[PDB]
Amino acid sequence: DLPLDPLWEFPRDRLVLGKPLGEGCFGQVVRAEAFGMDPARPDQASTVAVKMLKDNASDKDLADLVSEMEVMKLIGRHKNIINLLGVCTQEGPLYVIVECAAKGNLREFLRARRPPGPDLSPDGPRSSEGPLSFPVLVSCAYQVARGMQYLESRKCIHRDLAARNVLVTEDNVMKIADFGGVHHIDYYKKTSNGRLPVKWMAPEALFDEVYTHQSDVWSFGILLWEIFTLGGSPYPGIPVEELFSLLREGHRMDRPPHCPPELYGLMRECWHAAPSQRPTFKQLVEALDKVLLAVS
Ligand SMILES: */C=C\C(=O)Nc1ccccc1Nc1ncc2c(n1)N(CCc1ccc(NC(=O)C=C)cc1)C(=O)N(c1cc(OC)cc(OC)c1)C2
């Protein structure tokens, strides 16, 4: 079976499975109620997210989920990542119980909060004020950088860092998801929501199958661009075939509208050809911290 880990094992009868949250990478994820996740409050309800094997899963799918579980045990706890809460490995299906972020992923969060165009009638003194302000976008960027910096300190490379893979809590805290098959990537693969994940890959990863923390920094720069386009799709209108040759030529995305040169500056730094010429996550946290303090 699977060994028992009393440090993490949670009785499965203390879960009530609820609404499916969609296809997770290695299985499906369901919202759930947990009673007594805090052992000091055994009858207290909390909302959690539960990852489990899809129907008719292989022995490989089990291996993947179990390895994701073991990664999460190892990396420890941080404010800006999805944290492991517990597991159900005994006498029933494998459950991996993690934090549930009320507002969904960062890309959807941004796209849903785009400002009103000059389309609707002025109603109220804030008719043109959108939900999102510059300091809060910078805070989103800063928090992801702090999460990535933690992950890096734990020798963890993400390899798909993208806004879709950051979740947003009720208090607008960013939590990096799915930090733990690079030899088979379909670079033409479009996800069911229309995403082309090749557009987040560093040149060395895409061309040479090399991943480092500086590869993630490249992706971070793409995520920066998503934020300051409020959830835009990178390399707009560029199909994958054209992306290959544009990247070989050293092409980079344009500065987006309503983005200050400080932030487009950091994006271009993240996309320097040589990985040693990109900022480290520690440098990105510091740089974003300066902008955040300057504007708060
Ligand atoms: C809490 C109320 C709620 O339901 N919120 C909600 C509504 C709709 C969508 C998403 C959420 N909130 C939420 N919160 C935490 C987690 C998740 N969702 N999911 C599902 C969404 C998701 C995120 C990232 C995905 N990655 C990729 O597609 C590619 C990398 C896919 C789907 C979720 O999967 N998790 C989750 C995260 C991790 O990160 C380590 C690990 C696990 O299981 C081990 C699950 C959390």
mmCIF file of N, CA and C in Angstrom, residues 7-69:
data_model
loop_
_atom_site.group_PDB
_atom_site.id
_atom_site.type_symbol
_atom_site.label_atom_id
_atom_site.label_comp_id
_atom_site.label_asym_id
_atom_site.label_seq_id
_atom_site.Cartn_x
_atom_site.Cartn_y
_atom_site.Cartn_z
ATOM 1 N N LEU A 7 2.529 12.447 10.697
ATOM 2 C CA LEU A 7 2.751 13.884 10.672
ATOM 3 C C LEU A 7 1.766 14.550 9.713
ATOM 4 N N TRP A 8 1.403 13.842 8.647
ATOM 5 C CA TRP A 8 0.558 14.424 7.615
ATOM 6 C C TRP A 8 -0.816 13.775 7.441
ATOM 7 N N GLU A 9 -0.968 12.530 7.887
ATOM 8 C CA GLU A 9 -2.212 11.793 7.652
ATOM 9 C C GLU A 9 -3.431 12.459 8.330
ATOM 10 N N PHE A 10 -4.491 12.636 7.547
ATOM 11 C CA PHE A 10 -5.746 13.245 7.980
ATOM 12 C C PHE A 10 -6.878 12.260 7.721
ATOM 13 N N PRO A 11 -7.764 12.059 8.720
ATOM 14 C CA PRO A 11 -8.817 11.051 8.531
ATOM 15 C C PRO A 11 -9.770 11.491 7.414
ATOM 16 N N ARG A 12 -10.012 10.609 6.452
ATOM 17 C CA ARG A 12 -10.736 11.007 5.246
ATOM 18 C C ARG A 12 -12.206 11.271 5.530
ATOM 19 N N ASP A 13 -12.727 10.687 6.609
ATOM 20 C CA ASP A 13 -14.096 10.937 7.003
ATOM 21 C C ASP A 13 -14.313 12.344 7.528
ATOM 22 N N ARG A 14 -13.226 13.070 7.769
ATOM 23 C CA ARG A 14 -13.312 14.470 8.182
ATOM 24 C C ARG A 14 -13.363 15.435 6.996
ATOM 25 N N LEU A 15 -13.468 14.863 5.796
ATOM 26 C CA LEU A 15 -13.638 15.618 4.552
ATOM 27 C C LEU A 15 -15.036 15.452 3.988
ATOM 28 N N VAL A 16 -15.602 16.534 3.493
ATOM 29 C CA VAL A 16 -16.777 16.437 2.658
ATOM 30 C C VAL A 16 -16.420 17.024 1.309
ATOM 31 N N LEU A 17 -16.295 16.158 0.308
ATOM 32 C CA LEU A 17 -15.929 16.591 -1.042
ATOM 33 C C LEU A 17 -17.049 17.418 -1.655
ATOM 34 N N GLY A 18 -16.666 18.489 -2.341
ATOM 35 C CA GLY A 18 -17.617 19.405 -2.944
ATOM 36 C C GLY A 18 -17.351 19.648 -4.423
ATOM 37 N N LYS A 19 -17.451 20.913 -4.815
ATOM 38 C CA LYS A 19 -17.394 21.319 -6.219
ATOM 39 C C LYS A 19 -16.034 21.062 -6.895
ATOM 40 N N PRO A 20 -16.055 20.398 -8.055
ATOM 41 C CA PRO A 20 -14.831 20.188 -8.835
ATOM 42 C C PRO A 20 -14.248 21.533 -9.269
ATOM 43 N N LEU A 21 -12.940 21.703 -9.134
ATOM 44 C CA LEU A 21 -12.306 22.977 -9.454
ATOM 45 C C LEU A 21 -11.657 22.936 -10.826
ATOM 46 N N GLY A 22 -11.681 21.756 -11.442
ATOM 47 C CA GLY A 22 -11.159 21.567 -12.781
ATOM 48 C C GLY A 22 -10.030 20.559 -12.837
ATOM 49 N N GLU A 23 -9.458 20.413 -14.025
ATOM 50 C CA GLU A 23 -8.327 19.522 -14.233
ATOM 51 C C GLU A 23 -7.037 20.092 -13.634
ATOM 52 N N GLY A 24 -6.543 19.461 -12.572
ATOM 53 C CA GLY A 24 -5.212 19.746 -12.067
ATOM 54 C C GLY A 24 -4.250 18.938 -12.917
ATOM 55 N N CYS A 25 -2.952 19.228 -12.826
ATOM 56 C CA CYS A 25 -1.963 18.587 -13.707
ATOM 57 C C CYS A 25 -2.006 17.075 -13.575
ATOM 58 N N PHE A 26 -1.836 16.608 -12.344
ATOM 59 C CA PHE A 26 -1.685 15.194 -12.075
ATOM 60 C C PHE A 26 -2.852 14.377 -11.547
ATOM 61 N N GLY A 27 -4.054 14.790 -11.931
ATOM 62 C CA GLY A 27 -5.302 14.420 -11.296
ATOM 63 C C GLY A 27 -6.265 15.588 -11.226
ATOM 64 N N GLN A 28 -7.410 15.351 -10.606
ATOM 65 C CA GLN A 28 -8.450 16.356 -10.538
ATOM 66 C C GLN A 28 -8.474 16.985 -9.146
ATOM 67 N N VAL A 29 -8.960 18.212 -9.087
ATOM 68 C CA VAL A 29 -8.992 18.947 -7.833
ATOM 69 C C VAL A 29 -10.407 19.354 -7.489
ATOM 70 N N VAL A 30 -10.776 19.100 -6.239
ATOM 71 C CA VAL A 30 -12.112 19.336 -5.758
ATOM 72 C C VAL A 30 -12.038 20.273 -4.540
ATOM 73 N N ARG A 31 -12.938 21.244 -4.471
ATOM 74 C CA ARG A 31 -13.123 22.022 -3.245
ATOM 75 C C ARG A 31 -13.697 21.055 -2.200
ATOM 76 N N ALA A 32 -13.390 21.253 -0.920
ATOM 77 C CA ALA A 32 -13.947 20.397 0.132
ATOM 78 C C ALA A 32 -14.005 21.105 1.466
ATOM 79 N N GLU A 33 -14.879 20.622 2.346
ATOM 80 C CA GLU A 33 -14.884 21.040 3.738
ATOM 81 C C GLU A 33 -14.089 20.036 4.566
ATOM 82 N N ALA A 34 -13.233 20.552 5.435
ATOM 83 C CA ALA A 34 -12.477 19.724 6.372
ATOM 84 C C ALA A 34 -12.856 20.118 7.790
ATOM 85 N N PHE A 35 -13.137 19.121 8.625
ATOM 86 C CA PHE A 35 -13.427 19.366 10.035
ATOM 87 C C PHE A 35 -12.249 18.998 10.912
ATOM 88 N N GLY A 36 -11.758 19.966 11.666
ATOM 89 C CA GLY A 36 -10.661 19.701 12.571
ATOM 90 C C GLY A 36 -9.295 19.664 11.911
ATOM 91 N N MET A 37 -9.096 20.422 10.829
ATOM 92 C CA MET A 37 -7.753 20.494 10.236
ATOM 93 C C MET A 37 -6.797 21.018 11.309
ATOM 94 N N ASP A 38 -7.266 22.006 12.059
ATOM 95 C CA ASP A 38 -6.662 22.397 13.332
ATOM 96 C C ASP A 38 -7.092 21.407 14.416
ATOM 97 N N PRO A 39 -6.164 20.556 14.880
ATOM 98 C CA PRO A 39 -6.540 19.556 15.889
ATOM 99 C C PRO A 39 -7.051 20.170 17.194
ATOM 100 N N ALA A 40 -6.768 21.445 17.425
ATOM 101 C CA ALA A 40 -7.251 22.098 18.639
ATOM 102 C C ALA A 40 -8.710 22.527 18.502
ATOM 103 N N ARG A 41 -9.218 22.496 17.279
ATOM 104 C CA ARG A 41 -10.610 22.834 17.020
ATOM 105 C C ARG A 41 -11.252 21.728 16.173
ATOM 106 N N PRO A 42 -11.416 20.522 16.757
ATOM 107 C CA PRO A 42 -11.772 19.305 16.020
ATOM 108 C C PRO A 42 -13.093 19.407 15.264
ATOM 109 N N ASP A 43 -13.992 20.300 15.668
ATOM 110 C CA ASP A 43 -15.269 20.405 14.974
ATOM 111 C C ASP A 43 -15.378 21.656 14.095
ATOM 112 N N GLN A 44 -14.268 22.365 13.935
ATOM 113 C CA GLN A 44 -14.252 23.566 13.115
ATOM 114 C C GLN A 44 -14.160 23.231 11.614
ATOM 115 N N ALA A 45 -15.062 23.794 10.813
ATOM 116 C CA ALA A 45 -15.020 23.656 9.368
ATOM 117 C C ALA A 45 -14.007 24.617 8.749
ATOM 118 N N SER A 46 -13.374 24.175 7.682
ATOM 119 C CA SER A 46 -12.531 25.051 6.854
ATOM 120 C C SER A 46 -12.655 24.584 5.404
ATOM 121 N N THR A 47 -12.447 25.486 4.458
ATOM 122 C CA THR A 47 -12.521 25.112 3.054
ATOM 123 C C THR A 47 -11.120 24.803 2.555
ATOM 124 N N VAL A 48 -10.962 23.638 1.940
ATOM 125 C CA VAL A 48 -9.675 23.188 1.461
ATOM 126 C C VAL A 48 -9.821 22.720 0.000
ATOM 127 N N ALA A 49 -8.689 22.445 -0.624
ATOM 128 C CA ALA A 49 -8.660 21.929 -1.975
ATOM 129 C C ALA A 49 -8.055 20.535 -1.921
ATOM 130 N N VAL A 50 -8.676 19.576 -2.609
ATOM 131 C CA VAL A 50 -8.230 18.191 -2.547
ATOM 132 C C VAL A 50 -7.893 17.694 -3.932
ATOM 133 N N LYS A 51 -6.636 17.303 -4.142
ATOM 134 C CA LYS A 51 -6.244 16.701 -5.406
ATOM 135 C C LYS A 51 -6.308 15.171 -5.292
ATOM 136 N N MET A 52 -6.860 14.522 -6.314
ATOM 137 C CA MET A 52 -7.007 13.057 -6.308
ATOM 138 C C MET A 52 -6.785 12.484 -7.723
ATOM 139 N N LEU A 53 -6.554 11.180 -7.841
ATOM 140 C CA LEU A 53 -6.408 10.580 -9.165
ATOM 141 C C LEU A 53 -7.695 10.679 -10.000
ATOM 142 N N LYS A 54 -7.548 10.988 -11.285
ATOM 143 C CA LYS A 54 -8.677 10.920 -12.214
ATOM 144 C C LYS A 54 -9.239 9.477 -12.307
ATOM 145 N N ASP A 55 -10.412 9.319 -12.903
ATOM 146 C CA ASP A 55 -11.004 7.998 -13.058
ATOM 147 C C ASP A 55 -10.158 7.126 -14.001
ATOM 148 N N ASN A 56 -10.066 5.837 -13.675
ATOM 149 C CA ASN A 56 -9.258 4.890 -14.436
ATOM 150 C C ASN A 56 -7.863 5.436 -14.719
ATOM 151 N N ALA A 57 -7.135 5.740 -13.648
ATOM 152 C CA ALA A 57 -5.779 6.265 -13.747
ATOM 153 C C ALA A 57 -4.753 5.128 -13.772
ATOM 154 N N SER A 58 -3.595 5.380 -14.386
ATOM 155 C CA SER A 58 -2.551 4.353 -14.512
ATOM 156 C C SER A 58 -1.728 4.238 -13.236
ATOM 157 N N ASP A 59 -0.778 3.310 -13.213
ATOM 158 C CA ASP A 59 0.124 3.202 -12.072
ATOM 159 C C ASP A 59 1.122 4.355 -12.079
ATOM 160 N N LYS A 60 1.306 4.939 -13.265
ATOM 161 C CA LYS A 60 2.168 6.108 -13.464
ATOM 162 C C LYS A 60 1.525 7.361 -12.880
ATOM 163 N N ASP A 61 0.225 7.530 -13.118
ATOM 164 C CA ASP A 61 -0.510 8.666 -12.560
ATOM 165 C C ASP A 61 -0.439 8.645 -11.041
ATOM 166 N N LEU A 62 -0.530 7.452 -10.454
ATOM 167 C CA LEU A 62 -0.373 7.301 -9.007
ATOM 168 C C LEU A 62 1.031 7.735 -8.574
ATOM 169 N N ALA A 63 2.037 7.311 -9.337
ATOM 170 C CA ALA A 63 3.421 7.677 -9.054
ATOM 171 C C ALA A 63 3.624 9.192 -9.091
ATOM 172 N N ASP A 64 3.064 9.847 -10.111
ATOM 173 C CA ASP A 64 3.158 11.297 -10.240
ATOM 174 C C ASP A 64 2.540 11.998 -9.029
ATOM 175 N N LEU A 65 1.305 11.640 -8.692
ATOM 176 C CA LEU A 65 0.631 12.320 -7.585
ATOM 177 C C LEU A 65 1.390 12.089 -6.274
ATOM 178 N N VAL A 66 1.833 10.858 -6.042
ATOM 179 C CA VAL A 66 2.590 10.541 -4.829
ATOM 180 C C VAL A 66 3.899 11.344 -4.749
ATOM 181 N N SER A 67 4.531 11.582 -5.896
ATOM 182 C CA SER A 67 5.763 12.363 -5.900
ATOM 183 C C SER A 67 5.456 13.843 -5.684
ATOM 184 N N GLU A 68 4.333 14.325 -6.211
ATOM 185 C CA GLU A 68 3.931 15.691 -5.919
ATOM 186 C C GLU A 68 3.669 15.865 -4.416
ATOM 187 N N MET A 69 3.105 14.831 -3.791
ATOM 188 C CA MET A 69 2.793 14.862 -2.363
ATOM 189 C C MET A 69 4.076 14.932 -1.548
#
